[PDB]
RNA sequence: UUGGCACCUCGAUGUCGGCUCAUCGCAUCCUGGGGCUGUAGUCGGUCCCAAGGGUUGGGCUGUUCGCCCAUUAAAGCGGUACGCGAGCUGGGUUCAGAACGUCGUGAGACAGUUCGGUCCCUAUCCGUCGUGGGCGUAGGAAAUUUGAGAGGAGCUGUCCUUAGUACGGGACCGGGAUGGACAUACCUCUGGUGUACCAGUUGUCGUGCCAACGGCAUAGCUGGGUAGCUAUGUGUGGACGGGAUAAGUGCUGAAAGCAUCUAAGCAUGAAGCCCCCCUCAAGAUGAGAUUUCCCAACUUCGGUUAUAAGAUCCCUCAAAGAUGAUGAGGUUAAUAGGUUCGAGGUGGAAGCAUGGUGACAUGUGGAGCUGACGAAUACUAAUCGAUCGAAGACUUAAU
């Protein structure tokens, strides 16, 4: 970080209604789906498995199993398409990136709560 | 990969135009009498 | 019309309308002052010289391009301004809406204006024929001795020589590139910065010129 | 950083040797390239010595070698002890500097610019 | 990134169980294709019965891929394996049911029939 | 093309196909204009003008050949030692081994088939791609004029509004944006790498035992990863009109009182087009170019003097780099290194305390450590110097 301009010209795009969470926690994102003309709200329940970036480029990933197939989403932390986020479970991991959950399946991919 | 014709004394002496050494800095000393290199350790230590 | 000189800071992202991500490039441009006004009855073409960065004034023993006097000083003394670091010319703007000593601000541009950025490239030094030009390599196995090297450079007996521009290895980098049809996301007057949608050529802390796209 | 025409392990070994030899006599003479690489390694060791906490002691033993210095009146002490001893006391009000480089003349065998690195 | 000689798993009850990409329609020189792209493949593994037999040349549309597509809002969505659905000539499913989730990029490809039978659409 | 002749090469002009990279033509495969049809609308038979760009992945026969599968706007024909082996392969042709069939009394022959079988060279000259030194202009620093040169140019598919009415399914007509291939710039995002960053763990050796730590085992192995470099990632481009033009369609109109695009004349008309437009390097001994600003005693300006954000030499460096060159700096100083913070990365240090028979929990604590990123601070180093240096003359006009 050389000068304090990049963080000064993007200080009006950051959010302040976001809760604190760490990789391994179960979240419930409320994405704002926009179809033909009607605006609905789709809920996506999963477990954070990544958290990189810094400032207005921060991003997070949530993994979940739909109908036997694993799905992964990734939206910018400060995105206006996210109604609100709410932590519902606090997991206990030993790393920062859980990439070993992509091969696990069944009761082997179970995370213990603190 | 082998010379087609032998080189003459003219062409050989023309290629050795930039092949030479250059005079160094040689900074004068304030109290020693002898000379020394610039930014060096001696009685002058440059000037 | 509407010309200005700025410095490339870095690259960030800004969310626009309908939550759409937009990658932008922060360009700082301040202390822009006209230095001269070329006419057609004294030079044969209308243009205006503009400065950019400032520097220290009068100095004696100074073996560095940062602070001294004489030549540059005098030319900068003609108008009411201090010595400039960079100087350029613009023959696309009107020479009747400016005055020797005016302060070119960043309020001339408005969000939604198409502009053309111009600047030198980074530089990779001596590069090969597989990097400089998009060429393919030979088999990596099957008893092959041809990898990242060029192929033939000519024919045979007929025209026994190499035509100009055979695309061979050499230094590739420092080149003047000009991206066209860009966009001004938002302009800030507090920090005097401009947000261009996309990426301009050149490295960090580099000189870049902005001009209103002709097309 | 520089590689000094050596392997990752070889380079790591040489650096440790030079540092230990610059704390034994506090005045060694070598090449310029190596003098501009050991100047940012012995400076970090002195910083650890200024702390004087147990943590630093273990952190300073991951670079310093095992040697035996001989002082006056038949007095012996390991380099580590000397680093956390007089050396630590000497520099306690100076924040930065420590080492100093002095350019010299070229060598005879080859044209290598030799220098002299000593502690201020 | 589905290209030539790529085996995908059928996600419907049309009789097929595994197909092999033969060509990616879209233009001359086209190399790879993503979700919402039509491709010509051949049945390599079928189930006893059904309407599609082994060694048949049919057309299908990708619905899931390991390398997920990127949204215009800056969002991503990758799956666990590649899958497709044997369609007809008027973008109509040859089966009657769909298994697993389906991408929301099929709505812009005029695939209402296939998007109105998928259990989940994200 | 298969041949005819035997003029260059037998003190060697050493090679069929494929690979890499190219250039040129037009007897036009695709896109563009037209004309006539025994030319229903779509669409296409033929003919004329037109060369600017673009012309795909596989299976197989031994392959130049060909046949097939699936695409595409299209999968055109040629020339350059049947382009290219001091750029690559060696499959084919192929040399010593060995089978089979026919032929021969036999050694063996066969434009029969089959398995196996060493492709040498440190670039002198011209040529090409980059990059400097020296002088010249009668010049010290900037900023430029530029038509001489190079590059790039016209591909698709839907939507939807007079009606899907003419024509008997399906037309040319102004005109926001979606794609494919290709070109160019960049690292915010998704990834890759990241051998002086952090963590886990196996064997063995060394400081009495055990530890902590260090050495070696591909970086010992495994999971992540900053800066930088990167594509499969993110942006932009190819538009536009202008001027003559080709085939052609015309309007007037004459050396047969008619006619006639013609001998004058006036129009219109192509991916035409090299022109213009757009992008890039560029003072051109046809000493050239131009503008703004800065610079004087010697002593008959003989240079005895010499000055100029005027040049170096030397030194700290990186947005630059093979070396030189270019750029950021040299004490009136933040150029590098430290030192104190910060960003990001790893993921909970040591000590102490408690819990447990023990392996191990837990708390003090988003703890501790951190190469290249950044800010602040002269603590170390860029120190006394030395050298080299614009042009103003003639002649002859007008002043």
Q: Is residue D64 within 8 Å of D15, Cβ to Cβ?
A: no
Cα separation, C208 vs B25, whole angstroms: 40
Name the method of structure determination: cryo-EM
Which residues share a beta bridge with C64?
none
Cα separation, E37 vs E6, whole angstroms: 14
Q: How many distinct helices (H) and strands (E) make up chain A?
A: 0, 5
Chains E and B touch (3+ CB pairs under 8 A): no
- Which are the contacts of D28, defined by CB distance < 8 A and separation ≥ 6? D18, D21, D22, D116, D117, D118
Helix axes D42-51, D8-24, angle to 10 degrees: 60
Cα separation, B5 vs C68, whole angstroms: 58
Distance E28 CA to F249 C1' (A): 39
First-last CA distance in chain A = 36
Radius of gyration of chain A from its Cα atoms, rounded to whole angstroms: 16
Q: Which two structure tokens, joined as six digits, stand for D108?
A: 């005879």
Domain E1-122 has CATH 3.10.20.600: no
- From the list D98, D93, D68, D95, the residue with the least C-alpha distance to D80 is D68
Q: Which two structure tokens, joined as six digits, stand for D107?
A: 């060598």
Cα separation, E99 vs E87, whole angstroms: 15
What Å resolution does this PDB entry report?
2.9
Cα separation, E17 vs E86, whole angstroms: 11
A42 phi-psi bin (left φ>0, alpha ψ -120 to 50, beta other): beta
- Find the Cα–Cα–Cα–Cα dihedral B3, B6, B9, B13, rounded to 10°: 0
Nucleotide nearest to A6 (CA to C1'): F188
- Which are the contacts of B22, defined by CB distance < 8 A and separation ≥ 6? none
Of all helices (H) and strands (E), which one includes residue E5? none
Give contacts of C14 with chain E, Cβ < 8 Å. none
Long-range CB contacts for residues A105-114, cutoff 8 Å, separation at least 24:
A111/A24, A111/A47, A113/A89, A114/A90
Give contacts of B41 with chain D, Cβ < 8 Å. 102-104, 116
The shortest CB-CB distance from C13 to any of A3, A8, A57 is to: A57
Give how far A26 is from chain C: nearest CA, Å. 25
- Which are the contacts of B33, defined by CB distance < 8 A and separation ≥ 6? none
Residue D83 in 3-state DSSP?
helix
State the alpha helices, DSSP H only, in C87-134.
129-132
Q: Which residue is nearest to nucleotide F69 (CA to C1')?
A: E22
Cα separation, A97 vs D28, whole angstroms: 47
Radius of gyration of chain C from its Cα atoms, rounded to whole angstroms: 23
* CA separation, residue E95 to residues C191, C208, E99, E116 (Å): 61, 59, 11, 13
Q: Is residue C37 within 8 Å of C48, Cβ to Cβ?
A: yes
Report the number of distinct structural domains present in chain D: 1
Give contacts of A76 with chain C, Cβ < 8 Å. 13, 15, 21
Distance E28 CA to F248 C1' (A): 36
Residue E114 in 3-state DSSP?
helix
- Which are the contacts of D53, defined by CB distance < 8 A and separation ≥ 6? none
**What is the DSSP code string of D8-74?**
HHHHHHHHHHHHHHHHHSSEEEEEHHHHTTSTTTHHHHHHHHHH--HHHHHHHTTTS---EEE-SSS
In the DSSP assignment, the letter for residue C95 is S
Domain boundaries, position D89: 1-120
Cα separation, A52 vs A97, whole angstroms: 9
Phi and psi, residue D10, nearest 5°: -50, -50
* CA separation, residue E120 to residues A62, A64, C60, C207 (Å): 17, 13, 77, 52
Neighbouring CB atoms inside 10 A of C98's CB total 15
Residue C175, CA atoms < 13 Å, CB-side half-sphere: 9
- From the list C124, C123, C139, C128, the residue with the least C-alpha distance to C167 is C128
Per the annotation, binding residues of C for Mg(2+) are 136
Per the annotation, binding residues of C are 136
Give how far D105 is from chain B: nearest CA, Å. 8
Q: Do E73 and C21 touch (CB under 8 A)?
A: yes
Give how far B14 is from chain D: nearest CA, Å. 29
Each domain of chain C, given as residue ranges in start order, spans 1-215
Residue from C12, C15, C21, C24 to probe the interface with E (highest E Cβ count within 10 Å): C21
Pairing relation of β-strands E38-46 and E16-24?
Answer: antiparallel
- Taking only residues 27 to 66 of chain E, the set having a beta carbon closer than 8 angstroms to any beta carbon of chain C reads none
- Which are the contacts of C9, defined by CB distance < 8 A and separation ≥ 6? A2, A3, A5, A6, C26, C27, C28, C193, C204, C205
Q: Do B40 and D103 touch (CB under 8 A)?
A: yes
- From the list E122, E120, E121, E116, the residue with the least C-alpha distance to E96 is E116
Broken C–N links (> 2.5 Å) in chain D, after residues: none
Q: Which two structure tokens, joined as six digits, stand for D82?
A: 């000397």
Residue C17 in 3-state DSSP?
helix
Give contacts of C10 with chain A, Cβ < 8 Å. 2, 6
Nucleotide nearest to E67 (CA to C1'): F190
Q: Is residue C3 exposed (0-12), middle (13-18) or buried (19+ Cβ within 10 Å)?
A: buried
Give the residue carrying structure tokens 């230095």. C35
User: Which CATH number fits the domain that encloses residue D111?
Assistant: 3.90.1030.10
């Amino acid at each position: 970080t050389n000068h304090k301009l990049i963080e000064a010209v993007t200080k009006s795009q950051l959010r302040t209604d976001l809760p604190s969470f760490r990789p391994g926690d179960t979240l419930r994102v409320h994405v704002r789906i926009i179809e033909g003309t009607r605006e609905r709200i789709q809920v996506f329940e999963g477990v954070v498995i990544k958290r990189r970036g810094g400032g207005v480029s921060e991003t997070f990933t949530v993994r979940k199993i739909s109908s036997g197939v694993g799905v992964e989403r990734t939206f910018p932390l400060h995105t206006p398409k996210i109604e609100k986020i709410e932590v519902k479970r606090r997991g206990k991991v030993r790393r920062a990136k859980l990439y070993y959950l992509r091969s696990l399946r069944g009761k082997a991919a179970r995370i213990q709560e603190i | 990969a082998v010379p087609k014709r032998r080189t003459s004394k003219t062409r050989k002496n023309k290629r050795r135009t930039h092949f030479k050494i250059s005079v160094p800095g040689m900074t004068e000393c304030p109290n020693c009498g002898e000379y020394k290199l610039s930014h060096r350790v001696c009685k002058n230590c440059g000037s | 019309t509407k010309g200005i000189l700025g410095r490339k800071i870095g690259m960030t992202q800004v969310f626009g309308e309908n939550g759409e991500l937009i990658p932008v490039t922060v360009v700082e441009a301040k202390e822009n002052v006209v230095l001269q006004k070329k006419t057609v009855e004294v030079d044969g073409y209308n243009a205006i010289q503009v400065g950019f960065e400032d520097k220290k004034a009068y100095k004696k023993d100074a073996k560095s391009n940062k602070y001294a006097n004489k030549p540059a000083e005098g030319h900068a003394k003609k108008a009411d301004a201090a010595p400039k670091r960079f100087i350029r010319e613009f023959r696309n703007v009107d020479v009747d809406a400016y005055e020797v000593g005016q302060e070119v601000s960043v309020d001339t541009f408005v969000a939604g204006d198409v502009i053309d950025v111009t600047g030198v490239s980074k530089g990779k030094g001596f590069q090969g024929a597989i990097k400089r030009h998009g060429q393919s390599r030979g088999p990596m196995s099957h008893g092959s001795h041809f990898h990242r090297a060029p192929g033939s450079v000519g024919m045979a007996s007929d025209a026994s020589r190499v035509f100009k521009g055979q695309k061979m290895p050499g230094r590739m980098g420092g080149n003047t590139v000009t991206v066209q049809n860009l966009e001004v996301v938002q302009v800030d007057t507090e920090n005097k910065v401009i947000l261009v949608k996309g990426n301009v050529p050149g490295p960090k802390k580099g000189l870049v010129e902005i001009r209103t796209s002709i097309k | 950083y520089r590689k000094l025409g050596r392997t990752s392990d070889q380079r790591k070994a040489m650096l440790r040797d030079l540092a230990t030899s610059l704390i034994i006599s506090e005045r060694i003479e070598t090449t310029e390239a190596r003098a501009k690489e050991v100047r940012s390694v012995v400076e970090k060791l002195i910083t650890l010595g200024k702390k004087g906490d147990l943590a630093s002691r273990r952190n300073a033993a991951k670079t310093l070698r095992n040697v035996e210095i001989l002082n006056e009146d038949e007095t012996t002490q390991t380099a580590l002890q000397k680093l956390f001893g007089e050396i630590a006391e000497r520099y306690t009000e100076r924040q930065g500097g420590y080492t100093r480089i002095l350019k010299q003349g070229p060598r005879r065998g080859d044209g290598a610019e030799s220098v002299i690195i000593e502690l201020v | 990134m589905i290209q030539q000689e790529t085996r995908l798993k059928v996600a419907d009850n049309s009789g097929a169980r595994e197909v092999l990409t033969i060509k990616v329609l879209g233009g001359s020189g086209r190399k790879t294709a993503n979700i919402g792209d039509v491709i010509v493949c051949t049945v390599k593994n079928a189930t006893p019965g059904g309407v599609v037999k082994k060694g048949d040349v049919v057309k299908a549309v990708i619905v899931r891929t390991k390398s997920g597509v990127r949204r215009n809002d800056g969002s991503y969505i990758k799956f666990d394996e590649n899958a497709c659905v044997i369609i007809r000539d008027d973008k109509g499913p040859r089966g009657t049911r769909i298994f697993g989730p389906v991408a929301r990029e099929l709505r812009e490809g005029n695939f209402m029939k296939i998007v109105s039978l998928a259990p989940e659409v994200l």
